[PDB]
């Protein structure tokens, strides 16, 4: 079945953390990633993207020390830095176990799907969220999921959040279709 094939793909790219952690929650994160269309997961594997699950802060990892003490875009005036952010996506994917849900230090409906979407956008699709077509859709629909000063201002964040809505569950998929029909259609066409 497609679920088992996606888990097979994920078994080759997911890096579980050193040390001890909530193993059931880490498994739950993998099971949510397995709902992403296999085409995208296998394209990430082709590009040697590692999905790193972490048991500590993002900036405890050597490869993210360049973010120590830096304020992410949109976090200005909050006193928070990347040290306090539970997930990152783009050229890499890093995810703190236990912080999946909205409000756990981040605004996404689901951390792992949002961050992995960034990697798909950047690594696989050459920053499609900043392509002319998506910029047009973002200009009309980019505020319709709320968070208008973040999703509505950064097309790469609107893309990642829409992707997460599309793939998390049937409730979020239907909410995206109602709120952002052109974005939904774009994602339908992207998967074909």
Tokens 């078994």: give the residue.
11
Q: Contacts with Zn ion in 129-158 (CB under 5 A)? A: 157
SS3 68: coil
- Alpha-carbon gap, residue 57 to 83, rounded angstroms: 6
Rounded Cα gap, residues 62 and 110, in angstroms: 25
Please state, in angstroms and rounded to a whole number, the distance separating the CA atoms of residues 77 and 151: 18
Q: Which two tokens stand for residue 91?
A: 């050229």
Q: Which range of residues in 23-31, 55-63, 159-167, 177-185 is near Zn ion by CB under 5 A?
A: 159-167
CA 12 to chain centre: 19
Q: Minimal distance in Å, beta carbon 98 to Zn ion? A: 18
Q: Hey, which residues between 72 and 111 contact Zn ion (CB under 5 A)?
A: none
Strand spans (E) along 58-170? 87-89, 93-96
Binding-site size for Zn ion (CB under 5 A) equals 2
Instruction: Flag whether 63 is marked binding.
Output: no
Per the annotation, does 157 bind a ligand?
yes
Q: How far is the CB of 170 from Zn ion (least distance, A)?
A: 23
Tell me, yes or no, if 141 is annotated catalytic.
Answer: no
Shortest Å, Cβ 60 to Zn ion: 20
Q: Toward Zn ion, which CB reaches closer, 41 or 85?
A: 85
- List residues binding Zn ion (CB under 5 A): 157, 160
Q: Which residues are catalytic?
A: 115
Annotated binding site for Zn(2+): 114, 118, 150, 157
């Amino acid at each position: 079945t497609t679920i088992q094939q996606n888990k097979d793909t994920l078994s080759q790219i997911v890096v579980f953390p050193t040390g001890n952690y909530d193993k059931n929650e880490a498994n739950a994160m993998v099971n949510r990633l397995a709902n992403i269309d296999g085409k995208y997961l296998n394209a990430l594997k082709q590009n040697n993207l590692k999905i790193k699950l972490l048991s500590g802060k993002l900036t405890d990892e050597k490869e993210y020390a360049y973010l120590k003490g830096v304020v992410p875009k949109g976090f200005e005036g909050t006193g928070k830095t990347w040290d306090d952010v539970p997930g990152l996506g783009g050229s890499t994917v890093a995810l703190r176990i236990g912080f999946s849900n909205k409000g756990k230090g981040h605004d996404a409906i689901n951390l792992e799907l949002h961050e992995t979407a960034h990697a798909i956008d950047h690594i696989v699709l050459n920053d499609i969220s900043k392509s002319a077509q998506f910029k047009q859709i973002f200009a009309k629909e980019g505020r319709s999921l709320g968070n208008v000063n973040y999703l509505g201002v950064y097309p790469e964040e609107f893309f990642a959040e829409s992707f997460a809505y599309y793939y998390l569950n049937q409730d979020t998929n239907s909410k995206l279709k109602s709120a952002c029909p052109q974005t939904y259609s774009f994602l339908q066409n992207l998967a074909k």
